[PDB]
Structure formats: structure tokens, C-alpha cells
XYZ file of C-alpha atoms in Angstrom:
623
model
C 0.000 0.000 0.000
C 2.249 2.722 1.480
C 4.452 4.994 -0.744
C 8.225 5.043 0.010
C 11.062 5.675 -2.427
C 12.810 2.382 -2.070
C 13.982 0.421 -5.171
C 12.525 -2.906 -3.898
C 9.108 -1.644 -4.810
C 9.962 -0.564 -8.366
C 9.345 -2.059 -11.811
C 11.379 -0.758 -14.736
C 9.695 -1.074 -18.146
C 11.125 -0.495 -21.579
C 8.610 -1.112 -24.372
C 9.960 -2.000 -27.808
C 8.815 -3.206 -31.274
C 10.128 -6.695 -30.749
C 9.838 -7.141 -27.075
C 9.044 -5.315 -23.856
C 11.892 -5.316 -21.332
C 10.685 -5.703 -17.795
C 11.924 -6.476 -14.295
C 12.998 -5.081 -10.936
C 16.051 -2.780 -10.966
C 18.347 -5.017 -8.932
C 17.869 -7.897 -11.372
C 20.939 -9.027 -13.213
C 18.675 -8.933 -16.344
C 15.069 -8.071 -17.195
C 12.511 -10.435 -18.550
C 12.251 -10.042 -22.264
C 8.653 -10.367 -23.388
C 7.639 -10.554 -27.057
C 5.509 -7.644 -28.216
C 2.820 -10.005 -29.561
C -0.847 -10.790 -29.016
C -2.477 -13.663 -30.856
C -6.135 -13.233 -31.646
C -8.414 -16.051 -32.900
C -9.133 -15.172 -36.552
C -12.819 -15.901 -35.956
C -12.958 -12.909 -33.576
C -12.110 -10.270 -36.102
C -13.850 -8.538 -38.929
C -11.479 -9.508 -41.738
C -13.223 -8.941 -45.100
C -13.173 -5.330 -46.297
C -10.025 -4.011 -44.567
C -8.921 -7.395 -45.885
C -5.310 -7.776 -46.957
C -5.086 -11.302 -45.733
C -1.493 -10.462 -46.481
C -0.185 -13.039 -44.056
C -0.206 -15.061 -47.320
C 2.171 -13.643 -50.154
C 5.754 -12.464 -51.297
C 8.043 -11.661 -54.400
C 11.380 -13.072 -55.745
C 11.401 -10.712 -58.721
C 11.609 -7.011 -58.087
C 11.930 -3.778 -60.180
C 14.862 -2.425 -62.152
C 15.577 0.172 -59.503
C 15.820 -2.663 -57.014
C 18.107 -4.489 -59.444
C 20.308 -1.399 -60.074
C 20.727 -0.807 -56.272
C 21.551 -4.457 -55.485
C 24.127 -4.300 -58.448
C 25.675 -1.254 -56.775
C 25.712 -2.924 -53.372
C 27.481 -5.818 -55.132
C 30.107 -3.404 -56.333
C 30.544 -1.840 -52.925
C 30.981 -5.379 -51.491
C 33.549 -6.369 -54.196
C 35.628 -3.308 -53.264
C 35.547 -3.995 -49.550
C 36.594 -7.592 -50.082
C 39.418 -6.545 -52.486
C 40.507 -3.894 -50.046
C 41.250 -6.547 -47.400
C 40.976 -10.209 -48.628
C 39.287 -12.460 -51.185
C 36.552 -13.202 -53.861
C 35.542 -16.247 -56.046
C 33.354 -18.035 -58.790
C 30.471 -17.020 -56.481
C 26.777 -17.659 -57.155
C 27.031 -21.050 -59.049
C 24.971 -23.554 -57.048
C 23.393 -26.535 -55.196
C 20.281 -25.022 -53.618
C 18.802 -25.269 -57.043
C 18.754 -29.026 -56.106
C 17.591 -28.526 -52.437
C 17.559 -31.659 -50.215
C 15.331 -31.784 -47.112
C 15.867 -34.174 -44.214
C 13.117 -35.206 -41.768
C 14.066 -34.978 -38.112
C 12.929 -37.352 -35.430
C 11.512 -35.219 -32.589
C 14.936 -34.483 -31.150
C 15.225 -30.765 -32.003
C 18.400 -30.035 -30.055
C 18.665 -26.177 -29.866
C 19.493 -24.099 -32.991
C 20.617 -21.037 -30.912
C 19.769 -18.802 -27.842
C 17.120 -19.892 -25.208
C 14.578 -22.182 -27.267
C 14.134 -25.737 -28.805
C 11.097 -27.558 -30.425
C 7.727 -25.831 -30.716
C 4.899 -26.937 -28.468
C 2.053 -25.369 -30.427
C -1.194 -23.707 -29.366
C -4.439 -24.852 -31.145
C -7.191 -23.510 -28.760
C -8.555 -20.416 -30.554
C -11.027 -19.637 -27.805
C -8.781 -17.111 -26.044
C -6.153 -14.392 -26.626
C -2.525 -15.316 -25.934
C 0.376 -13.079 -24.909
C 4.179 -12.924 -25.432
C 5.990 -16.162 -26.038
C 2.678 -17.968 -25.715
C 1.422 -15.917 -28.601
C 4.488 -17.034 -30.621
C 3.307 -20.659 -30.645
C -0.266 -19.985 -31.772
C -0.806 -21.665 -35.163
C -1.351 -19.007 -37.806
C -4.219 -20.777 -39.637
C -6.256 -20.033 -36.503
C -4.617 -16.877 -35.091
C -3.444 -13.444 -36.189
C -0.812 -11.453 -34.286
C -1.121 -7.831 -33.234
C 1.584 -5.806 -31.588
C 0.523 -3.094 -29.109
C 3.941 -1.336 -29.275
C 5.909 0.459 -32.091
C 9.147 0.944 -30.225
C 8.278 3.091 -27.241
C 5.072 4.469 -28.724
C 1.674 2.824 -29.260
C 1.271 0.974 -32.526
C -1.351 3.192 -34.059
C -0.794 2.048 -37.673
C -1.667 -1.599 -36.917
C -4.864 -2.520 -38.700
C -5.931 -5.177 -36.150
C -7.037 -2.606 -33.638
C -10.345 -0.768 -33.995
C -9.703 1.784 -31.212
C -7.366 2.864 -28.426
C -9.514 1.002 -25.917
C -8.704 -2.220 -27.804
C -5.021 -1.353 -28.025
C -4.741 -0.477 -24.408
C -6.540 -3.550 -23.196
C -3.847 -5.667 -24.699
C -1.168 -3.319 -23.596
C -2.338 -3.827 -20.004
C -2.845 -7.564 -20.424
C 0.511 -7.831 -22.067
C 2.061 -5.961 -19.154
C 0.189 -8.178 -16.711
C 1.284 -11.351 -18.423
C 4.888 -10.160 -18.234
C 4.639 -9.103 -14.627
C 3.325 -12.628 -13.876
C 6.239 -14.928 -14.604
C 8.675 -17.377 -13.110
C 11.124 -14.573 -12.133
C 8.761 -11.641 -11.289
C 5.590 -12.763 -9.673
C 3.547 -9.677 -9.341
C -0.172 -10.038 -9.787
C -2.491 -7.123 -10.709
C -3.990 -6.749 -7.198
C -0.473 -6.026 -5.953
C 0.405 -3.496 -8.610
C -0.477 -0.722 -6.147
C 2.607 -1.598 -4.138
C 4.906 -0.749 -7.083
C 6.335 2.288 -8.768
C 7.472 2.239 -12.370
C 10.349 3.793 -14.234
C 9.201 4.045 -17.854
C 11.532 4.325 -20.869
C 10.210 6.595 -23.572
C 11.735 7.509 -27.017
C 13.853 10.705 -27.373
C 11.256 12.197 -29.641
C 8.245 10.811 -27.818
C 4.737 11.725 -28.815
C 3.210 13.495 -25.795
C -0.163 11.937 -26.345
C 1.325 8.452 -26.094
C 3.479 9.236 -23.043
C 0.617 10.890 -21.243
C -1.791 8.124 -22.101
C 0.663 5.563 -20.816
C 1.134 7.369 -17.491
C -2.692 7.683 -17.251
C -2.970 3.925 -17.883
C -0.221 2.841 -15.454
C -1.587 4.968 -12.562
C -5.308 5.080 -13.186
C -5.996 1.571 -14.581
C -3.119 -0.702 -13.615
C -2.974 1.374 -10.349
C 0.772 1.703 -9.881
C 1.942 3.872 -6.938
C 3.857 6.301 -9.212
C 5.578 6.694 -12.611
C 8.856 8.243 -13.770
C 9.958 8.595 -17.347
C 13.314 8.738 -19.195
C 14.394 9.129 -22.826
C 16.109 6.257 -24.548
C 19.394 7.966 -25.204
C 19.841 9.157 -21.598
C 18.975 5.703 -20.370
C 21.544 4.292 -22.730
C 24.157 6.592 -21.247
C 23.201 5.554 -17.716
C 23.439 1.949 -18.906
C 27.033 2.533 -20.013
C 28.773 5.802 -18.799
C 27.090 9.241 -18.610
C 29.827 11.674 -17.626
C 30.847 12.377 -21.246
C 29.223 13.915 -24.249
C 28.140 10.961 -26.398
C 26.191 9.985 -29.535
C 23.744 7.089 -29.275
C 22.802 5.009 -32.329
C 19.897 2.744 -31.416
C 19.024 0.078 -34.025
C 15.564 -1.337 -33.619
C 13.204 -3.494 -35.616
C 11.264 -0.830 -37.485
C 13.339 2.256 -36.829
C 16.859 3.416 -36.117
C 17.173 6.290 -33.612
C 20.220 8.555 -33.317
C 20.661 11.419 -30.839
C 23.386 13.197 -28.910
C 23.562 13.613 -25.184
C 25.568 16.199 -23.351
C 25.743 16.754 -19.648
C 22.514 15.109 -18.642
C 20.415 16.262 -21.558
C 19.315 14.751 -24.915
C 19.917 17.405 -27.461
C 16.673 18.025 -29.316
C 18.163 19.049 -32.673
C 20.430 16.100 -32.752
C 17.647 13.537 -32.757
C 17.000 11.618 -35.960
C 14.479 8.810 -36.425
C 15.373 6.746 -39.459
C 12.544 4.652 -40.906
C 14.288 1.368 -41.246
C 15.979 -1.079 -38.868
C 16.513 -4.711 -38.217
C 13.236 -5.571 -39.844
C 14.200 -4.429 -43.298
C 17.505 -6.256 -42.935
C 15.456 -9.358 -42.236
C 13.197 -8.736 -45.277
C 16.204 -7.965 -47.490
C 17.945 -11.093 -46.357
C 14.910 -13.259 -47.077
C 14.690 -11.699 -50.614
C 18.355 -12.117 -51.292
C 18.057 -15.736 -50.248
C 15.126 -16.188 -52.553
C 17.185 -14.635 -55.370
C 19.972 -17.105 -54.679
C 17.414 -19.912 -55.025
C 16.638 -20.702 -51.386
C 15.037 -24.178 -51.095
C 11.813 -22.792 -49.591
C 10.614 -20.711 -52.570
C 7.101 -19.756 -51.437
C 8.079 -17.772 -48.333
C 5.028 -16.356 -46.522
C 7.064 -13.575 -45.014
C 4.402 -11.512 -43.273
C 2.967 -14.589 -41.661
C 4.235 -15.365 -38.193
C 5.876 -18.660 -39.116
C 7.847 -17.253 -42.037
C 8.793 -14.039 -40.396
C 10.199 -15.945 -37.397
C 12.235 -18.039 -39.903
C 13.437 -14.876 -41.668
C 14.447 -13.366 -38.316
C 16.292 -16.461 -37.095
C 18.479 -16.846 -40.179
C 19.446 -13.225 -40.433
C 20.277 -12.946 -36.749
C 22.289 -16.204 -37.041
C 24.018 -15.402 -40.265
C 24.436 -11.712 -41.295
C 27.888 -10.144 -40.775
C 30.014 -7.250 -41.761
C 32.974 -9.427 -40.872
C 34.960 -9.593 -44.140
C 37.284 -12.119 -42.449
C 34.495 -14.668 -42.398
C 32.832 -14.183 -45.780
C 33.148 -17.414 -47.725
C 31.094 -19.716 -50.000
C 29.603 -21.461 -46.972
C 27.193 -24.214 -46.018
C 24.403 -23.098 -43.702
C 21.460 -25.054 -42.412
C 18.196 -24.539 -40.535
C 15.126 -26.418 -39.387
C 11.682 -25.406 -40.721
C 9.245 -26.347 -37.935
C 6.088 -27.962 -38.659
C 2.700 -26.327 -38.228
C 1.291 -29.746 -39.266
C 4.319 -31.674 -40.647
C 7.440 -33.500 -39.575
C 10.285 -31.150 -38.794
C 12.267 -30.575 -41.988
C 15.994 -29.763 -41.876
C 17.338 -27.970 -44.938
C 20.947 -27.174 -45.862
C 21.850 -24.156 -47.928
C 25.027 -22.395 -49.194
C 25.532 -18.613 -48.855
C 28.328 -16.360 -50.033
C 27.775 -12.602 -50.107
C 24.077 -12.317 -49.182
C 25.067 -12.350 -45.498
C 26.655 -8.908 -45.893
C 24.767 -7.383 -48.784
C 21.589 -7.480 -46.720
C 22.830 -5.401 -43.787
C 24.947 -3.313 -46.151
C 21.474 -1.862 -46.926
C 21.806 0.294 -43.922
C 23.702 2.583 -46.327
C 21.557 2.172 -49.426
C 18.252 2.320 -47.581
C 16.261 3.171 -50.699
C 16.199 -0.540 -51.387
C 14.392 -1.103 -48.089
C 11.719 1.236 -49.327
C 11.341 -0.695 -52.575
C 10.424 -3.986 -50.870
C 7.808 -2.953 -48.338
C 4.252 -1.653 -48.664
C 3.609 2.046 -47.951
C 2.158 2.858 -44.522
C -1.594 2.228 -44.030
C -2.300 3.918 -40.640
C -5.800 3.794 -39.037
C -7.350 7.238 -39.096
C -10.083 5.726 -36.876
C -7.387 4.985 -34.296
C -5.071 8.004 -34.958
C -8.031 10.369 -34.660
C -8.219 9.106 -30.990
C -4.584 9.988 -30.309
C -4.375 13.587 -31.604
C -0.898 15.035 -31.508
C -0.160 17.164 -28.457
C -0.772 20.870 -28.663
C 0.217 23.747 -26.361
C -2.990 24.546 -24.398
C -2.402 28.279 -24.893
C -1.090 28.670 -28.481
C -2.518 25.379 -29.876
C 0.788 24.667 -31.656
C 2.244 21.210 -32.120
C 4.393 20.956 -29.013
C 6.226 17.601 -29.216
C 10.028 17.835 -29.384
C 10.775 18.381 -33.076
C 14.334 17.969 -34.311
C 16.234 20.032 -36.857
C 18.173 16.877 -37.843
C 15.080 14.803 -38.435
C 13.810 17.495 -40.759
C 17.031 17.848 -42.758
C 17.748 14.128 -43.080
C 14.247 13.217 -44.071
C 14.204 15.959 -46.750
C 17.610 14.796 -48.014
C 19.578 17.904 -47.033
C 22.590 16.104 -45.560
C 25.920 17.856 -45.060
C 27.720 14.708 -46.277
C 26.120 15.305 -49.710
C 27.471 18.821 -50.115
C 30.694 19.435 -52.101
C 32.130 22.912 -51.394
C 32.720 24.154 -47.804
C 30.879 27.401 -48.383
C 27.486 25.821 -48.867
C 28.039 23.631 -45.832
C 29.177 26.556 -43.719
C 26.217 28.688 -44.791
C 23.669 26.002 -44.067
C 25.307 25.461 -40.682
C 25.199 29.225 -40.275
C 21.561 29.152 -41.202
C 20.543 26.536 -38.610
C 19.052 28.764 -35.893
C 16.718 30.156 -38.544
C 15.750 26.779 -39.809
C 14.875 25.755 -36.201
C 12.996 29.091 -35.697
C 10.980 28.593 -38.896
C 10.319 25.005 -37.696
C 8.853 25.757 -34.214
C 6.102 28.138 -35.504
C 5.727 27.883 -39.333
C 2.554 27.661 -41.407
C 3.690 24.182 -40.340
C 1.979 21.405 -42.129
C 5.520 21.681 -43.576
C 8.135 19.184 -42.336
C 6.627 16.245 -44.270
C 3.751 14.491 -42.444
C 3.569 11.007 -44.103
C 7.182 11.101 -45.424
C 9.564 8.462 -44.229
C 13.173 9.169 -43.465
C 15.432 7.001 -45.569
C 18.786 8.787 -45.000
C 21.846 6.454 -44.963
C 23.096 5.649 -41.461
C 26.565 7.185 -41.766
C 25.369 10.471 -43.217
C 22.716 10.594 -40.503
C 25.221 10.248 -37.665
C 27.324 13.085 -39.108
C 24.146 15.176 -39.277
C 23.239 14.353 -35.775
C 26.749 15.197 -34.472
C 27.233 18.406 -36.478
C 23.872 19.815 -35.297
C 24.245 18.392 -31.850
C 27.307 20.629 -31.442
C 26.338 23.751 -33.385
C 22.882 24.048 -31.747
C 24.245 23.857 -28.215
C 27.930 23.762 -27.243
C 30.196 23.272 -30.273
C 33.284 22.264 -28.241
C 31.786 18.880 -27.609
C 32.276 17.785 -31.268
C 35.449 15.905 -30.460
C 33.850 14.191 -27.539
C 30.866 13.174 -29.680
C 33.017 11.693 -32.445
C 34.903 9.641 -29.860
C 31.885 8.151 -28.046
C 29.409 6.917 -30.727
C 27.779 4.031 -28.893
C 25.941 1.323 -30.822
C 23.055 -0.239 -29.018
C 19.688 -1.891 -29.835
C 18.390 -5.392 -30.550
C 19.071 -5.037 -34.262
C 22.583 -3.590 -33.842
C 24.080 -6.997 -32.947
C 25.747 -7.460 -36.341
C 29.445 -8.348 -36.103
C 31.800 -5.705 -37.416
C 29.080 -3.092 -37.754
C 31.422 -0.829 -35.792
C 34.071 -1.633 -38.364
C 32.219 -0.721 -41.567
C 30.395 2.222 -39.996
C 33.791 3.626 -39.118
C 35.035 3.286 -42.706
C 31.953 4.976 -43.973
C 31.728 8.017 -41.749
C 35.309 8.622 -42.565
C 34.640 8.514 -46.346
C 31.514 10.635 -45.945
C 32.244 13.162 -43.200
C 33.200 16.380 -44.983
C 36.714 17.784 -44.417
C 35.380 21.090 -43.109
C 33.584 19.001 -40.470
C 36.571 16.708 -39.821
C 39.034 19.343 -38.685
C 39.338 19.273 -34.911
C 39.607 23.050 -34.932
C 36.219 23.573 -36.553
C 34.450 24.361 -33.315
C 37.101 26.987 -32.534
C 36.795 28.407 -36.040
C 33.016 28.223 -35.987
C 33.091 29.965 -32.598
C 35.208 32.766 -34.046
C 33.014 33.244 -37.097
C 29.828 33.612 -35.076
C 31.373 36.277 -32.856
C 32.716 38.177 -35.883
C 29.280 38.100 -37.515
C 27.861 39.336 -34.191
C 30.322 42.295 -34.453
C 28.656 43.284 -37.730
C 25.070 43.470 -36.421
C 26.268 44.723 -33.029
C 29.243 47.087 -33.244
C 27.412 48.740 -36.141
C 24.179 49.566 -34.199
C 23.655 52.735 -36.282
C 21.900 52.579 -39.697
C 24.469 51.485 -42.366
C 26.744 54.103 -44.009
C 24.582 55.066 -47.056
C 21.920 57.801 -47.033
C 18.958 55.489 -47.832
C 18.294 51.973 -46.519
C 15.867 49.111 -47.175
C 18.378 46.916 -48.981
C 21.265 48.538 -47.038
C 21.236 45.547 -44.741
C 22.636 43.545 -47.693
C 25.764 45.774 -47.787
C 26.333 44.230 -44.361
C 24.743 40.939 -45.507
C 27.292 40.987 -48.337
C 29.966 42.050 -45.830
C 28.838 39.032 -43.822
C 28.986 36.997 -47.034
C 32.524 38.320 -47.487
C 33.829 37.955 -43.909
C 32.559 34.355 -44.106
C 34.665 33.909 -47.270
C 37.519 35.794 -45.573
C 37.518 33.650 -42.441
C 36.618 30.589 -44.437
C 39.680 31.224 -46.634
C 41.782 32.438 -43.654
C 41.076 29.128 -42.025
C 42.189 27.172 -45.116
C 45.479 29.031 -45.395
C 45.697 28.456 -41.648
C 44.843 24.835 -42.666
C 48.121 23.914 -44.394
C 49.545 24.218 -40.849
C 53.141 23.827 -42.165
C 52.911 20.065 -41.442
C 50.647 17.580 -39.612
C 46.805 17.919 -39.408
C 44.532 17.559 -36.326
C 41.332 15.549 -37.166
C 38.286 14.194 -35.198
C 38.345 10.448 -34.673
C 35.407 8.118 -35.320
C 35.257 5.780 -32.288
C 32.223 3.601 -32.691
C 31.773 1.415 -29.674
C 29.433 -1.466 -29.299
C 29.103 -3.262 -26.015
C 31.556 -6.091 -25.512
C 30.896 -9.401 -27.299
C 28.509 -11.346 -25.011
C 26.658 -8.332 -23.749
C 23.237 -7.928 -25.278
C 22.841 -4.599 -27.013
C 19.042 -4.797 -26.619
C 19.307 -4.333 -22.836
C 21.596 -1.343 -22.166
C 18.495 0.872 -22.058
C 16.713 -1.180 -19.469
C 19.986 -1.359 -17.447
C 20.307 2.409 -17.629
C 16.721 2.904 -16.482
C 17.295 0.493 -13.636
C 20.305 2.607 -12.641
C 18.124 5.716 -12.484
C 15.694 3.604 -10.532
C 18.300 3.044 -7.823
C 19.519 6.565 -7.137
C 18.559 9.659 -5.148
C 17.289 11.362 -8.302
C 14.180 9.270 -9.168
C 12.682 10.236 -5.821
C 12.174 13.790 -7.006
C 10.862 12.366 -10.387
C 8.057 9.958 -9.445
C 4.702 11.190 -10.653
C 2.285 9.742 -8.020
C -1.488 9.228 -8.418
C -2.257 12.320 -6.435
C 0.341 14.157 -8.474
C -1.655 13.028 -11.529
C -5.295 13.703 -10.471
C -4.710 17.291 -9.327
C -2.376 18.275 -12.202
C -2.811 16.015 -15.238
C -0.027 15.963 -17.819
C 0.954 19.365 -16.381
C 3.273 17.818 -13.700
C 5.639 16.736 -16.432
C 6.475 20.415 -16.523
C 7.810 19.999 -12.905
C 8.711 16.333 -12.271
C 10.912 15.215 -15.180
C 14.531 14.431 -15.983
C 14.195 16.247 -19.318
C 12.526 19.530 -20.184
C 9.159 18.269 -21.230
């Protein structure tokens, strides 16, 4: 009952697209619970909204898809030349695919599982790992979460109420488990630390708090943004850039001295899930023995996920015409082992992180519920009525394809950089249906990270550039690809412009801003000419010129009569045998254990008197 700030009585929760991470803070590890609910097909209206799409895929693809895969094949060739080896290649044996029946002795393939003890009773809903064994001829799977937020675009939900009921029943199922055995009538003894994305949607956050306190009846809730949690989960002192690779999205953001820098945040619309889809396709195109792959069905998706997780690498050392195998488990058959050869598909697929346009080519365009979305309006300031979610300069640039890495001269780069504070100003109160609504962000990973880091510095404290480039942490369930650190490092280094590689940029940039400020400032009287409406351009052309002057002065100062100072690119995953999917939960559980959270727990009484308005006063980030 009673409300003390003691960690024993705290549950730390980190929703994600693949699985919700949950446990007590002092746990070595949290329970990992699949983000899945299995619904008997006979319970749902499935005619008009239709797309029984759980049943179809496509080995052949467009030219553009062919072109891009050809170019990926080049990039691969070059990497392999640049270190090691090639061969005769594609010429094959999977054409003549041999399957081998297994006695029911499915010794483990990998991880925590072995054979599948299926669920045939379609007279109830199932949750988590239970949902994962429901036979898909009887059940459909919905997923309450899209990585932190509520999965509004799912078409299996007719309303928030529906969505929330399986959020709460999914949370309950998790909370009731061999290792945490907390039933719903005891929820009011617990407080919750909730992990929330960096660019959270206020209506989701607020709804979730409302749900945890008002319906699940938790004592109190405290929230934290993914990137800060990931810093707590590793080491927070420094300035650092977090790259989080998830199933559906990749999130990048910088963190400096306790805060997640708004204009550094980028949400990229691709992640481990497109790698998985790419991999399946590539396997199909290299004549994979299972040719009709029902990829959006549970059974086939699971198969696609297993293989890619088992097999995809950036490790050039290990890329060889190889024999791989797998067992295809049997909805109503004997278990069939298959053996297949792979060569380059294991790297081409994740290489797509840098040619993400191909991801776009192979998935259907979003089909969000406006019946559901209409019930989660985007947050608006109660006074001005203006969209008031965090809204990041870097998201807007990268989405629109204005990436610094794609600019050639230094002047354009410098000017755009110089323009930033206007671009953010325009952003925060435009005739703003501008900053594309439906548009997905398909910017290549490496260019995105550079964007994030450049803006992360110039919008706040530029002198942290160095520190950012030497603490890029890679984290997230889909980031567990060997040698991702390695190739990412190559690529930032090829792509980062030279202007933005010089370790003295911040110092230069800092000088230029001051000297521009001495043109608006120490000329506070109306410019020299008699008449002035354009006479601000004779100081806007003197600005144009001083830029060129200092820009050039820097370059002559660049020769430096010898050796050149240059930002590193330290990309740092967690050690082999740590799980990158769990840093965040770890970090949250560290918050959960310290003096700080005490001040940050929104309690029920907090919430009934004040509503979402407490977030303005109890929150580790400026809400």
C-alpha cells in the first residue's frame, strides 16, 4: 500500500517493437517479453479491410531494385578486395535442395529455445511467447507497441480502448512470470520507471502514465528518454552519440551533460526488420530451397528473423562460399531440416543500412488507421494550440535529403550550418503542415550520424564535437551485427566532410559567429549610405565576405606547415557477449536506484490534481 522511495518496490519497463523489457532494478537482467498478441481469426472482422497479407511475397523485383543491389554488389567487391578475397560465387546446389526429416529431437538451434509446443485452442487471446506458438491458420498477431510508442498504424485494432486492453494484459502477463511474480492486485505496491523515445509523442506518453496509474494502479511513474537511459546503462559523464538500431526504426541522438539534445535527434525509418526482409529476398534470389516464403505470416517471419540474426555479418574475415542449415518447424508436418550455401548475401543485406532506398522498394507504404489516430491527436500547447512535441532540426534535414555529407564545397556547408538557428525558428512556428507528415526518413546511417553530431554541437555547445566523435555508442536489438562498428567507421570517414573533420572547426566556428555578431552589433547605427531598405545587404554581403575571408583564412591556416589535427570516429558497441538490446533497461534500472528518481516519481495524487501538467515539474528532461 504505502508509498516510500525504495527500489525494492519498483518495476522498470522499456517497451519496444520486438519485445518489452521488464523487471525489478536489482535484477541481473530483465525479462524479455515478445511484443505479440495472438487473436483467434474468428474474432475479427477480416473482409473489407482485408489484406489477408499473411499469405504472399516476391522473388522478382523492379529495375531500380536491381540497379541498387548491383551497386551494393560493387561496394561489397571493393571492400573484399581492399582486405581479402573473392571467387566463382553464385554457381549452385540449392537449385537441387535436399530436405531431411528430423525425429523429434530438435536439439537447440541457438539462444534460449528448442522444439515448438504449439497452441491450437482459438477460444482465447494469448500473450508474449505464448502468442508465438499460436498456429497461424487459426490466429493473427497484433503488436501493441511500435518501439516506445503505441502501434497506431496496426490494422488489427479498432480503437485505443482495444489497443490499451492488450497493452495492459501484455504488461500483466509479463509481470506474472517465473522470475517476477507480481499479480495485478499487488500493482499498487509498485512504482514504475518508464523508458520513452527521445522524440516521444506526448499523447502516447501521457496516455501511458494515465494507464499505469489510473488503470493498472501503480503507486507512481517516472519517465526517461532512450538515449539518456543508454548513457546511464554505459557511462554518462561524457558527451556521447547514441545510435539505437531497432526493428522498425533506427534512432540517433546526442547527449551532453545530462540532456538529450533536441536538434540532434534523428528517427530513421528502417531497422533490423528491413535487414530481415532484405535477407529473405536475397536468399530467394539465390534460389533458397523454400521458394514460397510467406514472409508476413508469423511462421515465415520468425524463420526470416532467425536466419538473419544467425548469419548476417560485416565481418569480411568470415565471408566465404559457406554451407548453412536450418530447421523449418512444422505447423502440421514432420520437422524438416534444410541445408543451404551462402556467399555474399550475409553482408549485402545489412549493407542496406547505407543504401536504404532498397528497403523502401520492398515494403508496402504505410496504411495507418485514421479511426485509431483520430483518438490519439498530436499534443498541442494549451495556450497557443501549436504542435508541441520535441521536433528535431536533424530529423527534418535528413528526411528531406539535405545532408551535409552530400554537399561538395565548404561554403554551402558553412552557410547552411550558419543558417541553422533560422531553420529551427521557422520550424517551431511555421505555417507548419511543412516538415513532411507522411514522409519516411530514408537517409543512410553514416550520413545521418554526421548530421546528428554536427547539429548536436552547433545548436548547443560546439566544443563537444570531439567528444561526440569519440563516443558513438551502438546499441539496440538489431545492432548486434558483427563488425558493424568496423564498416560504420570506414563509412563516416569517407563521408564526413573535411570542413567538419578538422578538430579546430568548433574553434573556427566559434570565431566566425562572434565576428558576424560584431557586424550586427558594433554597427548599431543605420548602415553608411543615405537610404536603406536593402542597405542591410551591404552588411549581408559584408557578412557573405567575412565568411569567405575567415573561411579562406582558415584554409590558409589549414596547411599548418605540417601535420593535421582531425576528429576520430570511435564507434563502440558493447563487448561481445553483452546484449545490445538491454543497455536501455539497465540504464533505467540505474536511475531507478539513485537519489534522483525520488524527485521524479509522478504519483497518483500528483496526476489527479495536475494532469499531464506535472511533467512540466517532475521530469529528468525539459518536457
